[PDB]
Amino acid sequence: PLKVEKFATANRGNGLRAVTPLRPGELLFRSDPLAYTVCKGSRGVVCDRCLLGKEKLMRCSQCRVAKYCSAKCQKKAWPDHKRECKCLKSCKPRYPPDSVRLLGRVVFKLMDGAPSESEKLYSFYDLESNINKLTEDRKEGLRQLVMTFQHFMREEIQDASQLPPAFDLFEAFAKVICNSFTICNAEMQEVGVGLYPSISLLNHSCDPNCSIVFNGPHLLLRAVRDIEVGEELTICYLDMLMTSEERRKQLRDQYCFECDCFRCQTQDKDADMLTGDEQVWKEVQESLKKIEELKAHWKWEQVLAMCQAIISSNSERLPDINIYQLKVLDCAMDACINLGLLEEALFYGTRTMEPYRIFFPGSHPVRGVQVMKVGKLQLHQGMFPQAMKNLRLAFDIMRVTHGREHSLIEDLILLLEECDANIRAS
Ligand SMILES: C[S@@+](CC[C@H](N)C(=O)[O-])C[C@H]1O[C@@H](n2cnc3c(N)ncnc32)[C@H](O)[C@@H]1O
Ligand SMILES: O=C(O)C(=O)c1ccccc1
Ligand SMILES: [Zn+2]
Ligand SMILES: [Zn+2]
Ligand SMILES: [Zn+2]
């Protein structure tokens, strides 16, 4: 059997609980998506199937919207793509919202595909919609998505007989809002959106006992803390670099619940996250809206320029533990890595280390990868003792958060063996 089970919680609907004590690093579930698509900003930049950023991609002959790294990827993707292809084509100039493209793949998967293992524990039909908690503002947004779906899919779906039985598009989009998974690449950049209905049983905590990590579209659910028999399994739905007030708004707006976890009751880390002059980090927070938009579109040169204007401003500066300063540093590190500016990348990366230790407590895949990036930059620059220490730290974290089932662990072990060989060679 499995190590987890669905159960009805007392006040958060259905959830997942351990059937037996779980232990940090234990693999609990792994799932391909019911449906997934590349995210808007990564479209044309990464392969539609494997979500890897190749320097050579080939677009689908028919729609010219889907792009693939290889014949292998377009073939393995053709079942999921064949019907949307006609739709994307017939709307050529327009491209639909990610949610619409995603729901299209859900519908085709449910109509034309064998039962999906992703629904082993919990199906798309089962997913929470929160419709009785939605604001009229949200409901209006969903109505527009319904009509967008109807437009985009009018070449393949003209009426209900071409939808699953009693399939309601409004409810379907409501489910998408609060059960969408952000698919991240190995470097922890957002590249796609997917539905993993069994995994959607996991409720949220700002101090979770499990973590999900993506290896392409494939999702690994791991325990990151000790977990007792019958204890509910939780993951954090949100970015860790967020104050309690910011988490409140997004958990309300997107997930329709008021978080009662101990961190939100205590404002845990809020004060440290907002150190520095408020006027400055308000401006940086504003600037980050565009920086992250640029990063989403892989516009690294422009990302770096905006980040440098902040990190090396001629006006007042922020401490690196300020979460908005910290985001700017991370964006600039990633841009430098992609632009081949490794000295500068390392300068920014090392500055994020201590803030990441604070804000990503325990075993968090984002900190694991950040430390691995820093260790990799140090290795490449011949800083073997430093690189080894960070690579070991990355492995300490990622043996828990990634595990041997994740291909990045093999890469990291190879970097450990290389770095150790250099240190031996003295
Ligand atoms: C991914 S689903 C989790 C499974 C859901 N409880 C169910 O019955 O299908 C996310 C939804 O569960 C509820 N939820 C998740 N975490 C919660 C929490 N910490 N407190 C209260 N409700 C929560 C919210 O309605 C949210 O929109
Ligand atoms: O339980 C597991 O460890 C696991 O890897 C798994 C994932 C999906 C279905 C069955 C088992
Ligand atoms: Zn590919
Ligand atoms: Zn196509
Ligand atoms: Zn909370």
From Swiss-Prot:
Family annotation (CDD domains): SET_SMYD3 (cd19203)
Primary localisation category: cytoplasm
Function summary: Histone methyltransferase. Specifically methylates 'Lys-4' of histone H3, inducing di- and tri-methylation, but not monomethylation. Also methylates 'Lys-5' of histone H4. Plays an important role in transcriptional activation as a member of an RNA polymerase complex. Binds DNA containing 5'-CCCTCC-3' or 5'-GAGGGG-3' sequences.
SET domain sequence ranges: 2-238
Region (C-terminal domain) residue spans: 270-426
Protein name per its UniProtKB record: Histone-lysine N-methyltransferase SMYD3
Taxonomic path: Eukaryota, Metazoa, Chordata, Craniata, Vertebrata
GO molecular function annotations of the record: histone H3K36 dimethyltransferase activity; histone H3K4 trimethyltransferase activity; histone H4 methyltransferase activity; RNA polymerase II cis-regulatory region sequence-specific DNA binding; RNA polymerase II complex binding; RNA polymerase II intronic transcription regulatory region sequence-specific DNA binding; zinc ion binding
Signal peptide range in chain numbering: none
EC main group: transferase
GO BP term, pick one: establishment of protein localization
Expression (tissue specificity): Expressed in skeletal muscles and testis. Overexpressed in a majority of colorectal and hepatocellular carcinomas.
List of residues that carry Phosphothreonine: 20
Sequence positions that bind Zn(2+) 2: 60, 63, 81, 85
Subunit annotation: Interacts with HSPCA. Interacts with HELZ. Interacts with POLR2A; the interaction may be indirect and may be mediated by HELZ. Interacts with HSP90AA1; this interaction enhances SMYD3 histone-lysine N-methyltransferase.
Keyword terms of this UniProt record: Acetylation, Chromatin regulator, Cytoplasm, Metal-binding, Methyltransferase, Nucleus, Phosphoprotein, S-adenosyl-L-methionine, Transferase, Zinc, Zinc-finger
UniProt similarity note: Belongs to the class V-like SAM-binding methyltransferase superfamily. Histone-lysine methyltransferase family.
Zn finger region (MYND-type): 47-85
Species of the source: Homo sapiens
Swiss-Prot/TrEMBL catalytic activity: L-lysyl(4)-[histone H3] + 3 S-adenosyl-L-methionine = N(6),N(6),N(6)-trimethyl-L-lysyl(4)-[histone H3] + 3 S-adenosyl-L-homocysteine + 3 H(+)
GO cellular component, one term: cytosol
Entry EC number(s): 2.1.1.354
Pfam families: SET, zf-MYND
Residues reported in the UniProt entry to bind Zn(2+) 1: 47, 50, 69, 73
Localization annotation: Cytoplasm; Nucleus
Regulation: Histone methyltransferase activity strongly stimulated by HSPCA.
Residue positions binding S-adenosyl-L-methionine: 12-14, 122, 130, 179, 203-204, 237, 257
